[PDB]
Write a protein that binds this DNA or RNA. Structure first.
Lengths: 64, 50, 75, 71
RNA sequence: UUUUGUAUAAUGGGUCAGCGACUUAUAUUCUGUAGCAAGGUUAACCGAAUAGGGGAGCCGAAGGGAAACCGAGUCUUAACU
RNA sequence: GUUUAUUAAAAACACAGCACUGUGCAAACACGAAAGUGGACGUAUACGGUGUGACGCCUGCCCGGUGCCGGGAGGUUAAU
RNA sequence: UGAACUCGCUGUGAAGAUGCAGUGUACCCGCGGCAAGACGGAAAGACCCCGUGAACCUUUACUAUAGCUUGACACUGAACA
RNA sequence: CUUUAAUGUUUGAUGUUCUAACGUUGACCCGUAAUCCGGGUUGCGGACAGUGUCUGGUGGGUAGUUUGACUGGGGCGGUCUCCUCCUAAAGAGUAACGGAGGAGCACGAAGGUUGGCUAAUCCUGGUCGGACAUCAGGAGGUUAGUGCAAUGGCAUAAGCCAGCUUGACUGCGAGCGUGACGGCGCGAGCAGGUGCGAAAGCAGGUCAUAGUGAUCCGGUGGUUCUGAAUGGAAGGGCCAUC
């Protein structure tokens, strides 16, 4: 049987031109009054997945 | 955390708002600070609101 | 009742004298002011020392209190 | 929706391009309904596109080649 | 064999003969090799049939963005030295 | 008298007696998806459950808590 | 029952040596006895701990449910106050 | 409208009577030499009881499961995240159920800017007043102070006072530090629009280091981005936030 992609991962990473993955920072959901505006601004743009976790990601969704 | 959080609503028509904290009992008076409004790009008075 | 501790904040000097640095590089991490910023060196709200221009970092002593200053020479 | 390379744009039928027969040309797919033209280069024969979207590159390319754009 | 460490008084075996443990299917990634090459390849099925048909489809040459959409640019922003 | 057949036969279990409680008979209760059986071809001097354990002298105080029984003003409270 | 051409002592040693070091003693091989040793034989310790193991039992642990009980609707109607 | 009273209407709780549903493990007859069962006749109950669906309560009667780790065996006790110093061996880092302490906040000002000022502890004099209040002079030179434990810093003051204010602002951010990662910290400079100052300039919270919680699932506001025939909406997405 063909590999089953992890649905959770598929909703959190997209393939890019050079095979990397982009995601959204995990600190901009709630409890935002106490967070400085500078920190919130930096977390808004998407970020590339680190090399260490790249191996885990590609295994989770080998079809994208 | 006896001090609680509030929301400042821009007096202008735009719905942009800020958030902060204050002690109700010590200073139950409203806050009318003038702050920048990105939607209209002007400094306007923000009225405290729930 | 003891046994509590805080994780190390890795303070100290990051770039030493005679070392070329790029603008915005952090030279010293400190709590107070071990070193005072000189020419082309800025002091952050955390008292961190950063270079405002590209050059070699230099240490020296000035002031009546023999305090230690950090500057950048554009060379 | 799909993007049509400028290279294969002249490979559909002679020198006429239209939404129809692209599926016959098999360069987009039967299900694809919308279509756009992208700058791929290496286009020589003049072509005509009807109902497509040719933004800036292919538009200059076909116009220099001798094509035309119409809706 | 297991351990930092065993002649160990730690474990296992009385001996011989026979049997006894990294396999298979289907997907995906990488390496080697072969074919073709901006093209590559067919699946089911048809077939006096490992041939030949069948190009539905899949992968690739174009990406950016949540998306509309835009396009060798794109997003972010009122707008970017 | 009974019991751990196969390391414990006892102070354990049972016991006659005593008390509490349920049950008006299509009884309570038990076995059954149900029918139907047991209780009983009995029906309160009977039957079930529970505790105590011949007999003699007795069995004191407490109803807050947890149960059980009875009451009902007010509050709360599902489906609809 | 790994194989043995299977001594004592002191020391060393995975820390209690027939097997190592040093030293002492001992012709080869049976039989009848004793039971100190071969951490002797029998039983993958019941003790203790571990396993995000299991099984039974308990309750004012969690979530459920048989049973018991309340009401609404249905089977379920007709006349009076 | 406040305040009343006939007839008709929707009716519902309650009570009484009746029987034709239903009950009868009452009697008699028949099928039938039958304590079952069915039918008939009659009596007694009777719209109750009982059963089905829905629903509240009760429910170890029964069932499925849970009941942490560290640990100088385990249990008991204590600890679990974050901040300060020491251990830590002059970069960074560095363990122990090693030795000492704190934090889960506070502040529209205690923030920003401008202007000004400079303590502790002692000596001499002086109504109450005295060791220790306030006043004047001197010594002293940070032994003070710094919203909160500790360390480091701070006279250009980061300490104290006053004026005017909201830069505790929005979009970015070269380049760095820090971690396995998630992440966290520093940041000149650019654009827009502000505050203070004559001006150069300063201001993207607080002398710095604790004052914090990922994701999921949801709530509130904005935005035609999407909206499964089309036009809308619902629901998602994005931004802000709980």
């Amino acid at each position: 049987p063909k590999i089953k992609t992890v649905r959770g991962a598929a909703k959190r990473f997209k393939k890019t031109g050079k095979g990397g993955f982009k995601h959204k920072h995990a600190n901009l959901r709630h409890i935002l009054t106490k967070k400085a505006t500078k920190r919130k601004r930096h977390l808004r743009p998407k970020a590339m997945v680190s090399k260490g976790d790249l191996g885990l990601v590609i295994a989770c969704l080998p079809y994208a | 955390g006896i001090r609680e959080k509030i929301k400042l609503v821009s007096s202008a028509g735009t719905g942009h708002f800020y958030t902060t904290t204050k002690n109700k009992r010590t200073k139950p008076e409203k806050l009318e600070l003038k702050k920048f409004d990105p939607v209209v790009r002007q400094h306007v008075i923000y009225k405290e609101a729930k | 009742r003891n046994g509590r501790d805080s994780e190390a904040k890795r303070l100290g000097v990051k770039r030493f004298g005679g070392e070329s640095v790029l603008a915005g590089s952090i030279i010293v991490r400190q709590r107070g002011t071990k070193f005072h910023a000189g020419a082309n060196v800025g002091c952050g709200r955390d008292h961190t020392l950063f270079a405002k221009a590209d050059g070699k970092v230099k240490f020296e002593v000035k002031g009546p209190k023999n305090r230690k200053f950090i500057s950048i020479e554009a060379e | 929706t799909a993007e049509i390379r400028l290279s294969d744009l002249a490979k559909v039928e002679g020198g006429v391009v239209d939404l129809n027969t692209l599926k016959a040309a098999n360069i987009i797919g039967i299900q694809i309904e919308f279509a756009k033209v992208i700058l791929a280069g290496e286009v020589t024969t003049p072509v005509t596109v009807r109902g497509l979207r040719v933004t800036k590159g292919a538009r200059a390319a076909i116009e220099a080649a001798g094509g035309k754009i119409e809706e």
